[PDB]
Structure formats: C-alpha cells, structure tokens
Amino acid sequence: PSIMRRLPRKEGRIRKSLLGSQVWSISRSTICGNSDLHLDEVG
Amino acid sequence: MAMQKLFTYIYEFIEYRKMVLLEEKVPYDKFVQMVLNTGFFRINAETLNHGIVSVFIFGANGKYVHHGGDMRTLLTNTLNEKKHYEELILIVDKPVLSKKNILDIIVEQRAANPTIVINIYPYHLFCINIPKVSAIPKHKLITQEEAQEFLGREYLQPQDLMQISASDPPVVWLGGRPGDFVQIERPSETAMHAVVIRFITKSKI
Amino acid sequence: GWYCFSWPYRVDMNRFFQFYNEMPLVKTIAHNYVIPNGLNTIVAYMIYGGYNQEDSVIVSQSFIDRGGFAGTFYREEKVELESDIESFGKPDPLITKNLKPGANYEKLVDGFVPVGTVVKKGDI
Amino acid sequence: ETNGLFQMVATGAKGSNPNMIHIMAGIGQIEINTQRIQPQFSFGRTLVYYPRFALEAQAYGFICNSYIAGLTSPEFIFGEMNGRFDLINKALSTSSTGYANRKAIFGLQSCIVDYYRRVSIDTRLVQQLYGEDGLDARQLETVRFETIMLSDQELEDKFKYTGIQSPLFEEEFSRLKKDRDKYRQIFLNVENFNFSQLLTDVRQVPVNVASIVKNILLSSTSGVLPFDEKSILQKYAMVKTFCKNLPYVFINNIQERLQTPIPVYLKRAASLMRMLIRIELATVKTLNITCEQMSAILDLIRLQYTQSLINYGEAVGILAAQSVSEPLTQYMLDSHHRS
Amino acid sequence: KMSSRSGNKGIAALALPTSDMPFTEDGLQPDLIVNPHSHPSRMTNGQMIETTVGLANALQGV
Amino acid sequence: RYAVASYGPTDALTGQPLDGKRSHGGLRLGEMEHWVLTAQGAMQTIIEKSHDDSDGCISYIC
Amino acid sequence: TIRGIPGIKNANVVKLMRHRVDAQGKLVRLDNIYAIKTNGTNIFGAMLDDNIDPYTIVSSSIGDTMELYGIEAARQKIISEIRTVMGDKGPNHRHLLMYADLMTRTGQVTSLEKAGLNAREPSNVLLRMALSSPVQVLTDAAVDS
Amino acid sequence: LENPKISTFQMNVSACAWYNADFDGDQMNLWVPWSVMSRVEAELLCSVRNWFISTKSSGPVNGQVQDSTVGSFLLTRTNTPMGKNVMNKLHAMGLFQTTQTDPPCFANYSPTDLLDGKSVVSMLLRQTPINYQRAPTWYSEVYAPYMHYNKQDISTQIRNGELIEGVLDKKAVGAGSSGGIYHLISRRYGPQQALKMIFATQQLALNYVRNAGFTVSTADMLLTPEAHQEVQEIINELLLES
Amino acid sequence: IVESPSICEGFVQASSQTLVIIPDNERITSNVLTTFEATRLVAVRAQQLAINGSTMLKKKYSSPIDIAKQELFNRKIPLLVMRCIKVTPEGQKIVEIWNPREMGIPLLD
Ligand SMILES: [Mg+2]
C-alpha cells in the first residue's frame, strides 16, 4: 500500500472518485417496449 | 531532378517577393557546371528598401555541406562584404538539415550577426511554385497597425492567436518574419470560405 | 431447467429450478446425453400491436399462470461466529447496543427465523 | 404483394438483398480481409477435407448452398470462420473505440465557444469562428443552389429581369453571376486536393429561403400582382440592404443601428446566406410578392438565422469528439472487410 | 429473457389474457408472439424450419 | 433492477455511496456520463448528482 | 533505384470524375479522366516527375503534406483523412474542423496523445494528470513550480 | 405504471435511436431531479426534443422502425390482394382511436363509404402541412425487371399535408431519414411537434396491421423446383468460369 | 546577482479587480439570450422564489418554475446577465451587462 498507487489507473483516485461518481437517488432496470408511450415519455 | 526544378522556381521565388535581380541569368547547364565545380551557385536580389538578399544553392555532394569549416569560412567571408545584406538563403539537400555541425555553424553565424536573417532550407521548398499549389490557401502578410486594430476589437493579444512557423513554405515565399501577422483566406465546406489571422513564430532550424 | 436432480439436499446460491421441461418436438442427438431445458411454446410470427418490436415478445398471461417457465429461485445465507464472543439468539432492546433502526427482531425464534415464514425487507 | 420476407426488405423495415440471396439462392464466396480462405492447415491445405494444392473453388471458402438448403460440414466451418470475426470485431469495437474516445475527449474538451463565437483554450484561439460559420449542427437545412450548374446563357435566361430597363438590374444579375463563379472557383479547388470529393450544388444552410417564400405565397390572399415599377425597385433596395446588414446577425442589433464596421471574418461567415438570399429572392422570383410581404420574409430569414447560431459557452470540443469517435464503432465492426 | 434454440433471445414485454391473444379458426392461440422482423437480418432459418416440422409432428403424434 | 434512496452506506475514504446493489449503495455516474452532461450544458444537474447526491462538501481556504 | 521513384510500391490506374466549366459557361462532370493511385507516398518524388501535374498532388499522408506544403494544407489533410475513415454515415463537417484546428493550432501537427497535450496545454497539470500518468506529471509540476 | 407486477423501464421503440438501445436485455439508468435548479434545466435543455436532430450528422434521429415502416407501406399501398386498399367508415375511425390526438370528423361519411390509406394519412398530416416528393424505398431498379410496380406507388408526393400518391416507407418515415416527413415537420413546426407526429403515424400504421396482418413463414424462403434448378445453373456457370 | 526571495514576490493573494462595464452603445455580444442563459435565469429565479416567494406576476401559478418562466416571458424577471469579456493584466475586469427584460427569449410556451 502506497500513497501514489491510489492515483493512476481506471480504479484509481482520479478516474473513479473525481471524474466519475457514485450517486444517490438513482434507479436501474431492464428496458422494455411499450407502443402506447410517446417518444418523450418513459414508463 | 531537383536541380532542374530549382533552376526555374528559385527565380520564380525571387519574383514572388518583388525582388530585382542583380546578376544576369545563365543557362541551366552553366548552373550545373558551377554547382559541380565551385560547390554552390549564388543569386543576388534587390529588395524595395535597397536590402540585398543572397541565395546560395549547394550541391548535394559539395564540400560545404560535409565539412563545417568550409561552410564557416564561406559564411564569414560572405557576411563581411560591402553589401546592404538583409537575408542569406542557404538551400541545401534535405539530409544536410539533419547534420548537426552545419546547423551549429549556421547558429554561430546568426549569433555573430544579429541584424542579418540567416535561413537554411531544403530543396523541395523551391522545386515548385508554392503559392500556386492547389492545397495551399491564400496567405497574405498584414501590417502591424491593421493587426493591432483587429486585436483591439477582439480584446486579444498576439499570443492568443493561432501561430505559424516562419519556415512554413507559404510564409517563406511571403517573406514572413517572427512577430509578423499572416492573414489566410482558406476554403470552407460550411461557409464557402473563411479568414484567419496567424502569428508568425521562430523557424524550426 | 432441472439444474440438479439432488436440489432439495443442497443449499445453493442464485439457483433456479424450473418445474416443467419438455423434449423438443424436433430433438437432436444432444438430447440423448443431457436433459432438455425448455418448453414447446406455440409461437405466432406476427405483428400484434407493436409490443414485440426491437426484439421484444408478447406472452400469454394464461401461459404464465399455468406454470410456463415458472420455477423456484434459491438464495443462501451463511453466517459465522467468533469463537466464545458471538452467539445466536434474539437480542433485547434494553441491553444490546446499536440495533439497526426499523428492524423486525420479532420473527426470530432462538436466533433463527423459523422455516416456512415469509421474510420481507428489514426483517432480521 | 403477399411475401412478408420480401416486404420487410423492399420497404427498408429490416434486412437487405444479400440477406435474401443467402437465405434463398446461395451464400457464395467467404471473403476475410478481402481475400479467400488462406491455407492454415499444413502447407497448401485449407482443411482436412480437401487435398493439398486443391484447385476447386469450394476448398477456399465458396459456399454453394443457401441457408434454406443447409450447409455441409466444410461450408459450415468456413461460415464459422467468417462469423467468428463478427464476434471478435464487435468485442474490439468497444475497447478500441473506448481507447480512442478518451484520448480525443481529453485533447478537445478544453475547446469552448466564447462570447465572440470563437473557439479557444482559456485565452488561446482554436477557431476564429465555430465551424467557420458560427452555427449549431442541430439547426442546419440541406438546400440546393440553383445557379451553380447553369450555363452562362441559361443563367441570364432565368435570373436576368428584363421588365425594367434600369442599371440596378444589370448589377442585380452581375452579382448573381459572380457569386456563381466564386462558388465554382472555391469548390473546384476543394475537388483538386481530395481523392473523390466532388463539387455539389447542395449545401447545409441555416435558413431555407426558398421554402419561406413558397409558404408566404400560399398564405397570401393576392393572386398575380400587376406590374409596379416603384414596388419592384423598392423590393430590390430592401433585399440589397438586407444582404449588406446580414453579418450583423453575428454581433447584435445595437451595432447594426450604428452601422459600425464589420470584421472581415464575419463578412465571410455570411457568404452562403448572402448568396442564397440573392438567388431565392431574385427579382424574377419575387414578382408576386408585395413590399409588405417582403418585410415578412426578411424578418423571418434573420429570425431563423439568429436561432441557428451556436450558444456562448458550449463545449464544442466534447461535441466533436463524440461525433467523430462514434462512427469508429462501425469502422471497427467492418475490420474484416478491409485489407 | 427467453430465447429459441436458434439464438433469438427476447424480453417479455406484454402479457395478455387468454381472450386478448389472437386465435386461429380452429382455436389455436400462441404462447409467445415474436416479431417477424427478427428473422430477415439474422437468418435464423432453423427456427422457422423447426416450426414447420414441429407443426406436423404434433398432429402426427411423433 | 435497483433503486436506492436519498441516503445510505457511504465510503469512509471518499465519502461517496458504496458500490451497487449488494452493498446497498448507489449507482455510478461515470466518466462518460459527465462528458454527455457537459456536452449538453447541464451543469446544475452535475451539481445535483456529483455534489449534492455524492460527496459535495465545503472547503475553507485562506 | 532502377526505373521508379522511391517510396512507392504499386502504381495502379484509376478512373475518376471531375467537374469543369465549358466555353459556354456550363459545369459538366467528366467521367473519362485517368489518374494514378500509388501505393506509398513521396510528394517530392512525384513533384519531380514530368508526367505528373505537380500542383494537384494528393497524398494521404499528413506528415508528408505538412513537410512540403505547410500547416494550412496539413489542416485540410487531417479533415480529408478523418472523413475517409468516417465513412458516409459520417459526422458534420464542423466536427472535422474541430479536430484539425486543434491539432494544427501551434503551427505544428500535434497529436491526441500525452505528447500533444503537453504541447498545447503544458501548464494544465490537472488536465494532464487526469489523462494517463498522474505521478510523472505531478512530479514534473512540482520541480517546475 | 400502477401495475405492481411491472419492474421494467418501458419506452417507445422510436425512442431507442437516442440511446442505441434495444430490448434483448439492455439495462438503463433513471434518476429524477429533485432540486428546482436541476429540474428547470431538465425541461429547458435536456428534453429529448432537443435531440430529435442529430448533433453528429445534422439529421433526424427518430422515425418509424420495423412495424410502422412496413405498416405505413401496407396502409398507404394502392392495391391489396383483396383488390383496392380501402376501408369503410368504422375501420377508418378505428385507426385514430389510439393516436391520442383530436379525432378527425367522419360526419360526412356513410357507414358504407370507403376510405383509402392516403385519405386517412392525410387527415393526420393536415395539422402539420409539409411538402414532400421523393421516390420511396419500395421502388428499386433491382426489382423492376421481375416485378410489376404500380405507377401510383413509386412516387410519394405530399403537398400541404395531403398525401397525393405513393407509399410511405423507410425513405419518408424511417428513422435517420434526412429530408423525410419528420425532418420537414421539425424544420417548420419544431422537434416537439415532430415527435407527436412520429407517435401519431405509428398508431395509424399499427392499427392498420391490427386487422391486415403481417407474418413470415418458412415457405416465404423457399424457391420453386423450377427456380431452384435455375439457381444452381447460375452457380454451375460460376464454377465453370472458376 | 540573484539573491534570496523577497516579500515583494511570493504573494498568493491575487490583487483586487475593478469591474469595467462596457457602455450600452458599445456592446458586441448578441441582444438575444442563449438557451443556456435563459435556462440559468429561470432556474435562479425559481430557486429564489422557493426562498422568498415575492413576485410581481399578475397570474397565479402553483410552481416556482412556472412563475419563473412566465416572469421571463412577460419581461418581469429581476435579474441581469453579466457577460465577462476580459480580465486585463492591469487589474480591470471588462464585462457587458445585459437586461433580460429587453432581450429576445429563445424559449417557448
Ligand atoms: Mg442488447
């Protein structure tokens, strides 16, 4: 374990914590077809 | 056949900068004979402000491009002549541009002569009419006052503009010096043409 | 499909036992060596309201209610102790510390929820 | 009339002609990297089913059967060789595009449109005007320029107004011809320094001037207007002034009222719009338009030309990297169709 | 997610009651309704031949 | 499927939500999502998600 | 060298269509024009040939176009070469302009690699740290202040 | 969705072009803005009407896909294996009962009056009158020698919202079709109005196939014995030349 | 000789600036709000209405967003757009101040 190994890679500090972010108030699910919804609507 | 192309387009280049020839022309065979015998050919041109521009075309197998001492003495002897020199153009074969010693004499001569522009160029720069090439947009030097008016309207400094090297072929044919501004009229596939202004920076060699 | 023939004797994680399986009407030689997994569903190749576009399908609700592709899905909970420190048992609110808020400790019997009861979110 | 497979293909709903041919007639020659099946099975044999130095076409990936008839074992193997590339190139089209997308975005993201519609990196100019026209890419209309392909005789036949014998219409036409010549001169040059980039008489412009005139003509209660010398002259003066003040779209209405000088690079930006307006609002094309309807047309043109400008502070370097790195997924998918 | 043995997978999007599904003149109704547009670009012809063969297998009892 | 909350378990170092369903944390608005939101100009959405909903704090600087 | 120009391996013959203005002013597409599409690049070698028009030499090489013609022609070459890769379902022209104008901003053709970012934005350490290698970039930034 | 049994994110198939998505197992994220500032910015900037026109290619992104592309062709087709492609008043009214627009007026129609697909489409495009004239995808020189094209189907012409003639298919109504019906509606009435017409025309196309039917079978892929002999005569000539 | 660092350098605090407002007749930026600017104006006004609630709008609306949008459309929004043009090395901050109650609004309702 070192201080400067926290930085470099995709799982590092810069790319995982600063350039991206874990967030609250978000949802995920499989998407599905529905022909009764308008193009600007989501079920 | 770089020599044949040079023999015509170097004089086309002298014409493009609005310079008056001093010595009458010689046939191409005589030019080749002088290049092989002496090791170089010299063309002297008169500028509007009475400056003198000397062009040295060096053979690819001459001594001045192999031994730095010969180039050193040639430059020293040509740079202490009773002439109102403003620029010497040293056209050498492209491999000579990578020869470090020759460039060292070039920069030493530059340091010893601060008010004389010393440039060393490859053959291909003068083997064609560069402005008439289709892929090259229309370059044009602009005055300092006009550039300052543009920059003042745009709230810009000369260091914010796009920059172009002084050894860029169209800039060389224009005679662009570092610190100058070149307006480029270029084709566009969105507006049918566009205008940019570039700030000329120091030559790469 | 029948993922294992000894499934009731196993405590496996994320395993699915589909109840009904059928041999294909058009089978292959591969079905002499492995059990087939699936059903001979009646399929209509048609446009029906636009709900099967872009690789979606429309399913009969009756086919679902009758057990088509239905099965039982299993999960595992393995919890370990610390020797002579931890123990299994129902905690008491008036002694123990940092109990999880909004948790249902009332379904436990001798530290374990009895077999056959329905556990929902927040139940211990 | 009844075949569902054909109707899905012929209407563009799904599939292509080679899909039908493969299903029904024959797959043909399997071709990986624009060449036949190379012999990787021991020095001159493509498979164990064919001899060494076999000369028949089947030995090198020619599939004589269709899908509906079924492939033989060697044909299925050659088909699996071709189909494995589709899976390999799909898995590569994610990682290879991801490597190139992230380097393009980190190089271009600092480019942002400033208050002059220039693109800069914090002070330093990348573009004097975004896209050299200052417009948003979502606000472009593909429009044909009529005068480009016409000869000199049929240019004067169609666009020279002979109703009034005035020097004004001599220059109204001569301006049409030298816009035609300038367009030809510039875009024949672009043809020169490219491989296969031909001249077109079709541009993407922010305003469809032709459809604006057509729409207003439809809604006009008037029919064919009587000849009116002062109205025809007035409309020409209106259009000429509108083309003169067109670059003020890029500054504001305050400087247009003051008539302050326009930068040269902003005059060039309005070149296509100035050119298109002079074609579609030519005197020969605006005979049945009153001087009141012309003001409605001119007000609509510069309102649509204002709505199509790029916003201040738009991350256009991120927009460019997204728009260029996305077609690289399809470029990587067709990797085995290239040498 | 469901799939056929030809690799044509799909997501269950709508579930209809037995009175809303289409039916043939002889009373046959489908369990799944799949788009005809999943075939032409994928060329999963073994799935269509299986339906043709299996249709006569059921009636012949084989 | 997953939908979490306005709050939950948090990483001790970064102060951000934990990873995914199994840890009952949040979901990731990654590097490429911030590219798209920046391309759209939606900067108040980046404040809401990457600051208010992830780990935004106040730093004091002399 | 025996009977050729250096750098080019194969020289095929292609049929290309170009436009031209007639004597009556009409613009016509001429399909019966033959050119040479070489395999390999040498603009200067083809510039010295007397059977080739030297003013309309089209190289696919950005480095060779930059070497002989300049930064403005190299800018037009980057646009032409990205568009070739993009196909025909390609992006708008203003997205190719952004790439070429960035890559040619300093008067030299810079890359979209770590080296190119150093040339255009050297003092943007945080941008440059985020791209590839934070430790090397951070170390250089500290000693350089 | 008030049904507790539904766990999926449902969207119209014509909205898949924005996300490069399909329904083979894709998962998508969804977060609802709660702060006022982000909830204002979602409406004014990030609404999907702002990307009906592609920023990458400057063309429309959305249109008909796979059921309303062939459904529009079948609806606007001039003739049917049953004769002329007409429908009575009751079935013409039934095409508009799902479009969620304001229903047209059928009062000037007897129950036995017959309406064709071009009349029904015109009743919808009158609200956003555009002008369109291109040859459809249906017409191809590749099929012309071997097919009898109808002269009323190979020239799609719309003036002021009235479909004068021709069929509607990928060229006019397809997704990504530059200069198409929805690209023209967006340039004249806005990308939000174009999205309404993509939905409304998708309901007309799907409601036509609701009793026209569209299927694919194995016999659709089968050459006749005489035609199979002709294909292997063609292949035998290739192997002869080889 | 270059001696030890002095207090004259080593300042971390940047010197204060003077806000230089371009006169209204010399403004160069557009008199039309960008979509970004209109969105920002509406968002700021809606949040401030969520704080205060005091508006001069005649109509009644149940949301801060609707009130902000109608204030922008009816030219009653109490905000100004400051477009920062340049920061001069001698200390000035040249900006343009734009009144959104007399600019063109791109949004629709
Ligand atoms: Mg998928």
Cβ proximity of I30 and D251 under 8 Å = yes
Q: Is residue C84 annotated as a catalytic residue, yes or no?
A: no
Does residue E11 sit at the A interface (CB-CB below 8 Å)? yes
| Per-residue exposure over B55-80, b if at least 16 CB sit within 10 Å of its own CB, e if not | bbbbbeebebbeebeebbebbeeebe
Cβ proximity of C49 and H210 under 8 Å = yes
Do E and F touch (≥3 CB pairs < 8 Å)?
A: no
Distance from CA of I93 to the nearest CA of H (A): 28
Residue D260: Cβ within 10 Å count: 14
d(CA F24, CA F3): 9
d(CA H74, CA H120): 13
In sequence order, which ranges of chain B are alpha helices (DSSP H)? Answer: 2-16, 28-38, 68-78, 94-97, 100-112, 144-154, 169-174
Method: cryo-EM
| B13: exposed, middle or buried (Cβ count in 10 Å: 0-12, 13-18, 19+) | buried
Sheet with D124-127, edge to edge strand ranges: D112-113, D119-121, D124-127
Cβ proximity of D36 and D29 under 8 Å = yes
Residues 6+ apart with CB under 8 A from D47: D41, D59, D74, D77
* Catalytic residue from among C55, C65, C84, C110: C55
Residues 6+ apart with CB under 8 A from H196: A38, H101
Sign of CA dihedral B7, B12, B14, B20: positive
SS3 at position D331: helix
Residue G67: Cβ within 10 Å count: 18
Distance from CA of A36 to the nearest CA of G (A): 31
Mutate which of A30, A31, A32, A35 to disrupt the C interface (most C C-beta within 10 Å)? Answer: A35
Cβ proximity of G134 and A7 under 8 Å = yes
Cβ proximity of D97 and G67 under 8 Å = no
| Closest A-chain CA to F14 | A17
Do B and F touch (≥3 CB pairs < 8 Å)?
A: no
Write the CA distances from I64 to B102, I55, I60, I61, integer angstroms.
75, 10, 11, 8
d(CA B115, CA B120): 16
Q: State the distance from the centre of ligand 1 to the C-alpha of H24, rounded, in angstroms.
A: 5
Tokens standing for E22? 């289409």
Sign of CA dihedral C104, C110, C112, C116: negative
d(CA B10, CA D276): 43
Q: After which residues is chain E broken (C to N over 2.5 A)?
A: none
d(CA D36, CA G108): 43
Task: Please compute Rg for chain B using Cα positions.
Answer: 18
Tokens standing for D294? 């012309």
Please report the number of interchain residue pairs, chain F to chain I, with beta-carbon separation below 8 angstroms: 5
Residue E44: Cβ within 10 Å count: 18
CB-nearest to F39 from D102, D313, D319 is: D319
d(CA D179, CA C123): 80
> Across the strands, what pairs with G16?
G33
In sequence order, which ranges of C54-103 are alpha helices (DSSP H)? Answer: 61-65
Write the CA distances from H44 to D61, I31, I83, integer angstroms.
56, 20, 21
d(CA I87, CA H216): 69
Query: Whose CA is closest to I105, among I71, I78, I58, I61?
Result: I71
DSSP strand pairing (I18-21 vs I92-98): parallel
Distance from CA of A14 to the nearest CA of H (A): 23
